[PDB]
Amino acid sequence: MQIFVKTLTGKTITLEVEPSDTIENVKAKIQDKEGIPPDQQRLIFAGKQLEDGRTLSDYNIQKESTLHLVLRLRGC
Amino acid sequence: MQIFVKTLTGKTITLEVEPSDTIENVKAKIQDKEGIPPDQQRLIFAGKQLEDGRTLSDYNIQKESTLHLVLRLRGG
Amino acid sequence: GSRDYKRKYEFFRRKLKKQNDIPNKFEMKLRRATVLEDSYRRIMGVKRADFLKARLWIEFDGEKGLDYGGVAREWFFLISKEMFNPYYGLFEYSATDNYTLQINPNSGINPDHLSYFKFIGRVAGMAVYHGKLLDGFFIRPFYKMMLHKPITLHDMESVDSEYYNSLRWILENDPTELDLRFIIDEELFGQTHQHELKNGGSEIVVTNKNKKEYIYLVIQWRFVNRIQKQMAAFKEGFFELIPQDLIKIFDENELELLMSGLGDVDVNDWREHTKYKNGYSANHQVIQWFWKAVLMMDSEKRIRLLQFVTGTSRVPMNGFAELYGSNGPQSFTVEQWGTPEKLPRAHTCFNRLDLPPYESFEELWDKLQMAIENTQGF
């Protein structure tokens, strides 16, 4: 199933995934397309941060869902 | 002693001063360091503007005590 | 602001009037070392404020024959450095680690303050009247007050985010547990007066009943209540040059842009006052590429790089030598960190950029751009 990942600059990244693929895996796919390391990514779907351990299945992601990419680069 | 004067940017500076010594020449030591004419200086300790009519013993200034400088506006 | 802005501006400039009975020029002879007091005597001396509309003819320190507009641009710059200098007690930075300006509620320590605020108001109007810029940026609520717009909780977000979320929390969650009362404590020269927002003072404890009104009073107190007279004097000077009704075609963001422009950064200054860490030095290849990138950045991107590292897009009056962070003065810093496939990171509190040792300029460029562009202020 295709899903899209929207970045803060409205760029949309399209991915081919599977329900059993984990969030870590999706972030890996993102690294491949965009060069951003998984630890520097956060993914959001329906307003909630997605946990790396869990799969696309137990979050109700479906065909053509939109996820949001947030970069974790800044602190104090 | 060692005293601190905080300016309103947040720039604390540090003087070498004598408890005998009056506010006037404290201004002069500030005059010496950051080049601010003494007559243009308001000095403040414990929330009160120090009168050059008196002495830093009289104000009970103590070692590592903290002073506040604000500059004086001239007017029409 | 572009395009929509440019039309507004043209429409604005074309409405500005100047009377027939006004000299062709307004003459000032100033010395740079006393630019503030010399400018104050001259501008506050004028018989009619309208005289300030004639072409500025400025001469500094006896110098004859410099281009008029260049000197005027210099004057607006020098006079800004002085009027907004916190040392004088009129304006102050909105926080120890930011450099946006706000009226200092204690400005009255100089008895003449109100008259200086009118002077600044006039200078700000002269800038806008004559198509020049001030050098200094105010907090949003200052611009909203010029426009006669109410200040709200949301206006706090742009000034103090930490404070904002707390006020935000006791709007949604119950505040009773922690015995909060309608008391606010002001800090002044290391001292602490305490203030109560209403009569009855300390005894009232913040609950869900009084909750909203509490949040109100904190807002008016922090932004509005105690700088009324100062803001009225500034607005009075400013409206002697620019009609109040006409300025209202601009929202607060355009007004800021009208008065002060973008806030271009001095890159040479910045680079001169950078510290390096964990292996880097001014001569290190990666750092050479870094500054090459910054120099190849346009103005808004430079500003965004600066916000990304420091948490703010603004620079203090003394420039990058006088940068503060959360715990006192902190130079802009670049520390070697991570591996070349990482995006850069930032510790905003320490004005520190964690830059990977990228192995080509282009890779440094792409990764820096991606970092800056995909993080957001607000």
From Swiss-Prot, chain B:
Modified residues (Phosphoserine): S65
Known function: Exists either covalently attached to another protein, or free (unanchored). When covalently bound, it is conjugated to target proteins via an isopeptide bond either as a monomer (monoubiquitin), a polymer linked via different Lys residues of the ubiquitin (polyubiquitin chains) or a linear polymer linked via the initiator Met of the ubiquitin (linear polyubiquitin chains).
Protein name: Ubiquitin
UniProt site (Interacts with activating enzyme): R54, R72
Cross-link Glycyl lysine isopeptide (Gly-Lys) (interchain with K-? in acceptor proteins), sequence positions: G76
Covalent link Glycyl lysine isopeptide (Lys-Gly) (interchain with G-Cter in ubiquitin), residues: K6, K11, K27, K29, K33, K48, K63
Ranges where the Ubiquitin-like domain occurs: 1-76
Post-translational modification ADP-ribosylglycine, affected residues: G76
Residues carrying the site annotation Essential for function: H68
Coiled-coil residue spans: none
Subcellular location(s) per record: Cytoplasm; Nucleus; Mitochondrion outer membrane
Curated annotation (Swiss-Prot), chain C:
Glycyl lysine isopeptide (Lys-Gly) (interchain with G-Cter in ubiquitin) crosslink residues: K342
KW NAD (keyword) present: no
UniProt GO molecular function: beta-2 adrenergic receptor binding; channel inhibitor activity; enzyme binding; ionotropic glutamate receptor binding; phosphoserine residue binding; phosphothreonine residue binding; potassium channel inhibitor activity; proline-rich region binding
Keyword Nucleus: yes
Residues annotated as the enzyme's active site: C349 (glycyl thioester intermediate)
GO process annotations (BP): adaptive immune response; blood vessel morphogenesis; cellular response to UV; DNA damage response; endocardial cushion development; formation of structure involved in a symbiotic process; innate immune response; lysosomal transport
Residues in HECT domain copies: 48-378
Subunit structure and binding partners: Binds, in vitro, through the WW2 and WW3 domains, to neural isoforms of ENAH that contain the PPSY motif. Interacts with BEAN1, LITAF, RNF11, WBP1, WBP2, PMEPAI and PRRG2. Interacts with NDFIP1 and NDFIP2; this interaction activates the E3 ubiquitin-protein ligase and may induce its recruitment to exosomes. Interacts with UBE2D2. Interaction with PTEN is questionable according to PubMed:18562292. Interacts (via C2 domain) with GRB10 (via SH2 domain). Interacts with ERBB4.
UniProt domain comment: WW domains are involved in recognizing PPxY motifs in substrate proteins. The WW domains mediate interaction with LITAF, RNF11, WBP1, WBP2, PMEPAI, NDFIP1 and PRRG2.
Protein name: E3 ubiquitin-protein ligase NEDD4
Organism of provenance: Homo sapiens (Human)
Source taxonomy: Eukaryota, Metazoa, Chordata, Craniata, Vertebrata
Shown stretch of the complete protein: 937 to 1315 of 1319
